[PDB]
């Protein structure tokens, strides 16, 4: 009786997605930074499995596959299915930007072949800068008869061709995508600007769909149209920009009020970020994730402490209004994109 993705969304439930998986495996020594290739699926099944289980414990209702050769993709799907069966989670399929229509759809169908062999609960089109290739992806994938979702790494200023977010969203829903939204390249506020534009565009064309936000965990108020790749700090300097469990716990509420129901996360997101999403959205979802056992609510777990200040740090007010410090006073608070 595992409800499908569209059944959950249409019922009005929040479908929390897993965080940045290929970024969490790079800091854990299994992915390399620059090829970002998922060999660890076959080389280190225990690492990939444990990250999946940590995300499931956090509150993710989706186990996106970590996708030698198609053997790696297969093994990734078996690990994802194994972990998904342990909880209220759905295995998802992911198709990403190809590095002509005939060849792009060739690549996309060869990829989709594996996800059909493995019977993934639903599919995702993601990492798409251009929306032309994104609609090609939604077309090639909805032939499966499985729910398809389309995400782009495009800011409020539209795709690389220049197509505005609203036009991109309506073009994706037209192609068949039952869920649409933004992933990667921008922090949880610019992303929710793009998703609001997408909602408005879909309401303009009366093209009902489900909304989906998977932003960066980093703060990038100094990013140009080219996301956070062009920041001088990418990839090995973004530790300061990482969000806290309060920033993400604010983006969860923002995205919920904006009308997003597939509230997840991308590069920089960790299990505790996803737990922040789940704990924020708990009073609507009617439950708390498993990992909430190893956590209070708004730092409520520190109100048995030996010091008065650390004891008083345990409340929503303190952590919501606190202005955390960079700890790097010889560094600027913003940087010019290199590109």
């Amino acid at each position: 009786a595992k409800k499908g993705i569209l059944e959950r969304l249409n019922a009005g439930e929040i479908v929390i997605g897993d965080g940045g998986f290929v970024f969490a495996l790079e800091k854990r020594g299994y992915v390399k930074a620059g090829p970002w290739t998922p060999e660890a699926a076959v080389e280190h099944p225990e690492a990939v499995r444990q990250l999946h289980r940590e995300f499931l414990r956090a509150g993710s209702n989706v186990m996106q596959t970590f996708t030698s050769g198609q053997e790696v993709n297969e093994a990734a799907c078996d690990i994802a299915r194994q972990v998904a069966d342990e909880g209220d989670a759905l295995v998802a399929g992911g198709v990403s930007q190809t590095p002509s229509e005939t060849e792009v759809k060739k690549v996309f169908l060869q990829q989709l072949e594996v996800f059909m062999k493995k019977n993934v609960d639903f599919l995702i089109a993601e990492y798409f800068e251009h929306v032309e290739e994104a609609v090609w992806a939604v077309e090639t994938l909805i032939a499966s008869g499985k729910p398809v979702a389309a995400t782009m790494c495009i800011g409020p200023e539209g795709d690389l061709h220049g197509v505005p977010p609203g036009e991109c969203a309506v073009r994706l829903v037209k192609a068949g995508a039952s869920i649409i939204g933004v992933n990667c390249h921008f922090d949880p506020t610019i992303s929710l600007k793009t998703v609001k534009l997408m909602k408005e565009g879909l309401e303009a064309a009366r093209l009902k769909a489900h909304l989906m936000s998977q932003p960066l965990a980093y703060h990038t108020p100094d990013c140009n149209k080219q996301g956070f790749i062009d920041l001088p700090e990418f990839p090995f300097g973004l530790e300061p920009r990482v969000a806290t469990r309060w920033d993400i716990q604010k983006y969860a509420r923002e995205a919920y009020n904006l009308g997003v129901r597939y509230i997840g996360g991308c590069c920089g997101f960790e299990p505790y970020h996803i737990r922040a999403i789940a704990e924020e959205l708990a009073p609507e979802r009617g439950f708390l994730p498993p990992a909430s056992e190893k956590h209070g609510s708004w730092g409520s777990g520190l109100d048995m402490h030996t010091k008065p200040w650390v004891r008083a740090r345990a409340r929503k007010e303190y952590w919501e209004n606190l202005r955390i410090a960079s700890g790097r006073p010889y560094n600027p608070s913003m940087s010019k994109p290199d590109g």
Copy 2:
């Protein structure tokens, strides 16, 4: 033929220690922040085991155990021994400050703890988290009875212990108690920690009391910390993400500690497998080898030479990342904060 801790140190080798274990299991949902209890050792052996293995892959030569009650400590020791046997690493024992503070009862707690680590036959012991040096000396005394190498660390800054005992006096008093390795752990970022360790080195040289030096600093940057370390910063525990070091800051602390004469170069709260991998990759040309996890990393961002853009391809060199002045990304935030305490 697994060399012991003192054999490695006396041979001149660097003994890289594991990073903040309790802190890395809190962000992974297995430890709670505030009780900081290792209830995950029996509840989630796979999580603790995988963190141990990630640290081992990073380059750690020490699996400090993740230490009802004695059952949890035992299970932690079996997991640590399991992972240690998979590589060139040693299980370490850890005894820490008691919540109380008389000699007979503190040494009672210390001996009961030491019983389990004797049962499990840990390769060496650590006295750590000691604000006072009186209790740290008690620790070295109670633990060296094992006949195993004992190490002593305190979370004390350049201004001495809570009683005001200067770091050099602390180092001398610990080495006198029998501790073959002494150092500093926690409560301060790498530079303040390595200032304290410089003071300890000088103090030991003053009394001609030879010992091995050890540094397990915070991964956070805390230039605004008072004598009470990072715990009194308003951001602790759930606001320290900005302060987290990069693989370049830790890769600088590794060289600083090596030049300072520290050979047990590890890490504490905030340290992650990639930080320990930074330590190992920095100290590689001396150790004569690179850690396993270097297979999934270039040297100074070299792996980004593949990229399709010139401003992400030229990022692949020592100069760029060693001289880059990274940005906080929070321009509506101060770069420093006043300790609440």
Copy 3:
């Protein structure tokens, strides 16, 4: 043979204007912050005269008057004329917003009476949030037969009514204003965005005019549409935001390349800022201001020093590429507008 404002501009010359005059008399104890009244013109003629002479020495070619009641304005104009005659400067007239068309034009005409009595070389309409009142300004003032200039404190998002900057510019030039531009409420980059929009709008309608930039000396990258006044630091907290002689020496070149020829400054501008404008624009103007005798070019005057670092600070490269430090690490580098 003192060339008029329009003769200077039409000849292609740069007409450097004076800096923030009532803000520089508040830090000198003669103006009060909050009423911002020019009572000091009759109470302290020597202070107002010396500030005028400092600006004239800096390089200003415009001695805007520091304008009971009409007596104070007359005294201000006498001092301005006295100091203008000492150099290559023109006395300018200033009409500003009134705290119906008939009553507003009444106020404007009563003001203009004094400036006609004193025969000011040209007039300025300035500090106009709305462009409905600014066209009334240009209308009421061009009846003098004197050159009239119109400025608003409006950002790139238009006036308070919502009129875009380009429409404001064309509507001011239609009213008769021979010079148009922006003054106050934004730093020297947002201001030069608005002036770029004004140039573009004038070129859209073929409505030739002269451009004029009088920006804030403060840095306000965190300002909303209500200028710098709504920042929490206004008025007594803006010392950190103050520009250096390099920031202003860069805005001078920006405004020159943008096509602005009346390059001056508003609140926060000091004699050394105007001297920075003049020294930057010197190679075109063909000369240097008097105050350059007490200054080097890009810190060249520090070549005398005994220390090697302070000696090497004497370069264009060093001072143009240096990221100066706030010196307040317990302070945020940006702030949310209170309004």
Copy 4:
């Protein structure tokens, strides 16, 4: 009946000193940055006189002279005496580091000759890195029979030889100096650390003297023992570091509680900073300075605005507990000294 410096101090009164005079005339175009020479005293007597009068209006009770050769010094003393006679102020002499004891005392005596001709109400030894030359100064100057004061630009880590500040202070009191303190090179907080050490050292030796503080107006938390001159921002990049009228109103209270009664200011201090000192210390001195007429108390003058927030900014609570913003988010909040 103009009370002398020692009569005021011994009576328990606060003797507010003028601010950075050479530095204020550099921003006004009359002094050059790098030679820092006073030739404006004869070239521009009106500028020097107006700066003197602005400082006197602020609340300064001392009119330190602005000291072609000794003619410049005589003109400076004449202007200082002229302005001093207009209020409750005292002309003060000043001797600074030379660029052997016999030759140093020769130069110091040649200086003191002019101040004896002009009859300056008291003398100051200042800008002394070394305490050897500083005690030589106090020796050569106390022969005048006039009160002598000694200040050094030395931080909490002692003079350049290494003499601790307590030893410096006692060595200066022994030489005869009736007032001792610190001037320049450090912000108001480090300076007051040094003055605390001097007070403690004098109390160690039972060597009673009057305490004096003339700190920088800049914030320099990132300065090493060589003061602010070694910062990369010196001289033309210190605008961000400038203190506000609230920071100086805090330093005034600090110095008063520390036991300092000659509370003034060095480089970076302006008439409004000295007015901040005077307004802060008013409820003890029993009066407010003249310039307080053009100022409220803790921003009270903004009660007249039309906006609720700009009206509510008028509060001690608001301006005392406000973290002002640098407005430069692409710049670090601290910088490494270049020396």
